[model samples]
Target: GSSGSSGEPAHGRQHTPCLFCDRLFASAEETFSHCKLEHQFNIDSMVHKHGLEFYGYIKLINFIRLKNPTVEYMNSIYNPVPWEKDEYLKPVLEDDLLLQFDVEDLYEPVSTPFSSGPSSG
Candidate 1:
């Protein structure tokens, strides 16, 4: 039996990391929420402003890991990102769940922003 499928609710391997600090979260979405509230880091507007793609997102995320800049510093970013070095291209944390997040989902509107209530058709 080579097919691997364990647990009913897909338990385990669900923790996500924060871009602002070392704190962890149950989900990446929660991390974004936390940063916005706790660290004042707006991932939504940042994505829109930078027009981040995979490479750009990679640099931005990696930059945080390496520099560990404050929220104030990150909020007021520049055209030529300080974290554009080729070394930043490499993952600061191996197999980081934070790295796997889709940039689209971070800024884009959520699915009903979290489950819509039933409506009569």
Candidate 2:
């Protein structure tokens, strides 16, 4: 039961699809919470691997979707399982589909030992 622009009655909640999974939720908040709780592993993996926060990951997915409308945006985050040969990577890599992203724009420079000072020589 909910109230909104949709003419549905209070008992009938409008559903929105989850970003990562097949589940749907009655509201944006519910969808986000469900993703955070149910798909936390996938979410965390994206954040760690891409060095991006939650919203950043979403933006990256949106960008990829805009570029290649047919490809599943989630593929950028979830690779095929090891047991299954990765059919996607060969074409994607050979065609350089992922190269459309500018690395300078996607990541920030962090201080590292190599950049700390000039060579001792």
Candidate 3:
């Protein structure tokens, strides 16, 4: 067989880099193996969130990475998928770990002007 000047295989394919960990692999088998071993939890979580469909899984992972650059795993309780056109995605304090409080819980009443306090004469 005649070899190309580059000396690469005729059907040579470039390595595919994992979006989550940025690890590159030459073959899908190798990539799957690496993902399963190194990012099993992440893959599982994504699959669970987006179902078994490949497109949703890919989109969700990419979307999540775009939203959270430092996210390495998909272990968060709430995973926000990108909104459709005209739909806005709001950032929640809990989503970014900036605030932690139960929505069902009510805080104690404060003695403020709005809360039955005497108004200034």
Q: What C-alpha lDDT do the candidate models reach, one value each? A: 0.77, 0.43, 0.43
Model 3 over residues 1-121: C-alpha lDDT tens digits? Answer: 5875665558845565554566666643565467667766444444544552433444444454355433343454443444221222232211321111121122334656464645645
The CA-based lDDT of model 2 is what? 0.43
Candidate 2: how many backbone clashes? Answer: 3
lDDT of 2 by residue, 1-121 (tens): 5755757556744565544454655554565557557654243445457565434444544443333332244433344322123232232222222222233343556656666666657
For model 2, state the Cα shift of residue 110 in Å. 16
List pairs with backbone clashes in candidate 2: 1-10, 1-11, 2-10
Question: Using lDDT as the measure, what is the rank order of every candidate, best first?
Answer: 1, 2, 3
TM-score of each: 0.69, 0.29, 0.41
Native-to-model Cα distance after best TM-score fit, residue 70 in candidate 1, in Å: 0.4
In candidate 3, how many clashes are counted? 0
Q: 26-113 in candidate 1: lDDT tens per residue?
A: 7777887899898877776766778877777777888898898898888777878887677887889867666777876656555564
Global CA lDDT computed for model 3: 0.43
Candidate 3's C-alpha runs over 4 A off are 1-11, 40-45, 52-54, 64-73, 77-79, 82-121
TM-score of model 2 vs. true structure: 0.29
